[PDB]
Design a protein around this nucleic acid. Structure first.
Lengths: 287, 34, 141
RNA sequence: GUUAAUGUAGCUUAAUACAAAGCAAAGCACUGAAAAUGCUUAGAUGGAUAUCCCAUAAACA
C-alpha cells in the first residue's frame, strides 16, 4: 500500500513518456536519437449557462450540440495567433525563411484560391492544394508588403527559392493597389519530390519604401531571375519589416504542372526520385 | 410503479439531493477538521 | 532552349515531404515495450476532473493539433466541460482543428476501459464523420 | 489596542498569459467488500498593491 499505484495504465505511460522526455543518467531513446475584468464578465455568462435548465436537460438526454462556426471565430480571436506560429515552426518555415528567427503572428492572415467565381479554395496552414487548383493568383484577406514563396520548389539550388508574386506598399487591406513587382506564376513543383510547402508572408511596413531592386519584369518567365533569398532580402528591409501574418499549403505534382513547365516556363519537366584449377582454386571456395 | 414522467421529475431532484449531500459532506468534513 | 536545363537532383526541404509521401521512417524500435510506435501522429485524449482535452502529437513529441474544452470559444457554447457530448464536441472541435492544421491521418490507441467508454466511442464517431482517420497510412519501403 | 496569526474551492506559489488550472472529493449504474469501470454532480480570488489591510482567531489583553 505504501508504493503508489496509478489506477490506469496510460497514466504510467504518460508519466513514463514525460519521464523519458527529461534526460536521465540511465540510457533512454531520446539521448541517442535526440483582461481580468473581461474574465469576470465571462464567468457571469458561464454561471447563467449552467443555471439554464434547458442545457442541463439536453446533457442528461445526451442530445446537446455545439455550433462549430461560432467556436471557430472565437478561437481565432483569443488564442488563434499562437497556434498559427506552431504550425509554421513545425513545418520549418521560420528556419528556411528567416534562418531560425521566430515571430509570433499577430495579423490573422487568410488566403484562398478563387475557383472561377463561384467558390474560392481555402489555403489553410499546412493545407493541400493541387497545382491545377493554383493556376490563378489567390485572394488574401486580413502600409504592408505581401510576398509569395516556394520554399522547396527550387529545382537547382537548395537555399534558393522562387517568388510567385510580390506586392509592395500595400495600403491597409486592399491589395489591388500594391505594386506588382513580380508577376504571378502558377506553381511548378517537380515530379517525384512529393509535397512542396509554399509560405505567404505579411510584413508590417513602418514607412512606404520603393523596392526598385525587387521589381521584376512583367511578365517574367525566367527562373534565373526568379531565384532569391528571403533572409538577405528580409535583412535588407528588416528595419521596416516585421512579419505578422502567415499562410502556407502543400502541393503535389499534377497535370497542370506539365503545362506550367512547358507553356510559359518553356522548359523540360523536372523528374526526380529518391534512391534507397590451380589459379582459380585460390579464387573459388575449393582449395 | 413510477411513471416515466415521475422518473424524469425524480431524476432532476435526485441530482439536487446528491448535490445537497455533497455540499453537506464538504462542510461536514471541514467541520470535523475544525 | 536554355530554360530546358534541369538539375540532376532535387533539393526538397519540407519536413513532411517524406511523411506525406509515405516514405518517411516510422519508429520500428521499442520491441520490448507496448504499444507499437509505427505511427507518425497519435491522438492523446486526457480527461481531467473538470475538463476533457484531446491532442494530436507527432513522433517528435510536438502537438500539432490541440483541442481543449478549457479554451474559451468551445466552453461558452458547451454546457458542461465533462460530459459525453463534450467528448463528441471536442472530437468535432479537434477534427475542425485537425481540419485547420491540414493533418488528415492519425493513429489512436484507446485503452480497454477508454475504448469501452461511450463518450470516447462517440468522439471517434465525431472524428470519422469529420473525415479524420484513426488509422495512418503504412510506411513505404 | 500591543504581538501575532490569515483571507484563489479539501490541497497547490496552477495562474495571472492563451484558462481563474491541476489534484482531492461527489450521485447513479455495475452486487462479495474494496478497487476498477460507465454515465453523471458542486464549486474560489471574503483582499489590495505594481506589506499593511478590514474581516476572522489566538498569546498579551
Amino acid at each position: 500500500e505504501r508504493l503508489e499505484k496509478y489506477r490506469s495504465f496510460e497514466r504510467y505511460r504518460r508519466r513514463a513518456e514525460q519521464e523519458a522526455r527529461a534526460p536521465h543518467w540511465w540510457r533512454t531513446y531520446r539521448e541517442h536519437f535526440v483582461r481580468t475584468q473581461k474574465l469576470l464578465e465571462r464567468k457571469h455568462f458561464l454561471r447563467e449557462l449552467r443555471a439554464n435548465v434547458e442545457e442541463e436537460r439536453a446533457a442528461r438526454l445526451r442530445t446537446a450540440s455545439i455550433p462549430l462556426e461560432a467556436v471557430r471565430a472565437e478561437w481565432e480571436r483569443t488564442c488563434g495567433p499562437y497556434h498559427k506560429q506552431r504550425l509554421a515552426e513545425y513545418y520549418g518555415l521560420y528556419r528556411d525563411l528567416f534562418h531560425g528567427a521566430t515571430f509570433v503572428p499577430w495579423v490573422p492572415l487568410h488566403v484562398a484560391y478563387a475557383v472561377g467565381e463561384e467558390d474560392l479554395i481555402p489555403v489553410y496552414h499546412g493545407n493541400e492544394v493541387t497545382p491545377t487548383e493554383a493556376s490563378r493568383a489567390p485572394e488574401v484577406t486580413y502600409l504592408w508588403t505581401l510576398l509569395f514563396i516556394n520554399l522547396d520548389g527550387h529545382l537547382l539550388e537548395p537555399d534558393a527559392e522562387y517568388v510567385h508574386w510580390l506586392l509592395t506598399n500595400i495600403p491597409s487591406n486592399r491589395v489591388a493597389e500594391g505594386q506588382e513587382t513580380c508577376p504571378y506564376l502558377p506553381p511548378f513543383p517537380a515530379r517525384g519530390s512529393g509535397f512542396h510547402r509554399f509560405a505567404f508572408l505579411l510584413f508590417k511596413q513602418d514607412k512606404p519604401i520603393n523596392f526598385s531592386e525587387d521589381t521584376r519584369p512583367s511578365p517574367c518567365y525566367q527562373l534565373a531571375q526568379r531565384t532569391f533569398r528571403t533572409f538577405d532580402f528580409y535583412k535588407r528591409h528588416q528595419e521596416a519589416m516585421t512579419p505578422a501574418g502567415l499562410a502556407f499549403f502543400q502541393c503535389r505534382w499534377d497535370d497542370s504542372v506539365t503545362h506550367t513547365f512547358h507553356q510559359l516556363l518553356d522548359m523540360r519537366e523536372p523528374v526526380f526520385e529518391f534512391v534507397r584449377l590451380r589459379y582459380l582454386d585460390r579464387y573459388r571456395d575449393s582449395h | 410503479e413510477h411513471s416515466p414522467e415521475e422518473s424524469e421529475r425524480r431524476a432532476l431532484l435526485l441530482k439536487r439531493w446528491a448535490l445537497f449531500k455533497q455540499q453537506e459532506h464538504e462542510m461536514e468534513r471541514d467541520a470535523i477538521r475544525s | 532552349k536554355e530554360n530546358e536545363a534541369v538539375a540532376p537532383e532535387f533539393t526538397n526541404r519540407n519536413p513532411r515531404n517524406l511523411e506525406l509521401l509515405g516514405v518517411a521512417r516510422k519508429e520500428r524500435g521499442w520491441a520490448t515495450v507496448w504499444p507499437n510506435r509505427e505511427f507518425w501522429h497519435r491522438l492523446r485524449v486526457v480527461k481531467t476532473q473538470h475538463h476533457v482535452e484531446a491532442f494530436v502529437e507527432h513522433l517528435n513529441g510536438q502537438v500539432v493539433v490541440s483541442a481543449s474544452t478549457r479554451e474559451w470559444a468551445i466552453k461558452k457554447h458547451l454546457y458542461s466541460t465533462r460530459n459525453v457530448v463534450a467528448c463528441e464536441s471536442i472530437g468535432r472541435v479537434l477534427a475542425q482543428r485537425c481540419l485547420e492544421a491540414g493533418i488528415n491521418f492519425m493513429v489512436y490507441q484507446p485503452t480497454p476501459w477508454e475504448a469501452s467508454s461511450d463518450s470516447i466511442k462517440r468522439l471517434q464517431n465525431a472524428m470519422t464523420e469529420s473525415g479524420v482517420m484513426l488509422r495512418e497510412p503504412r510506411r513505404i519501403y
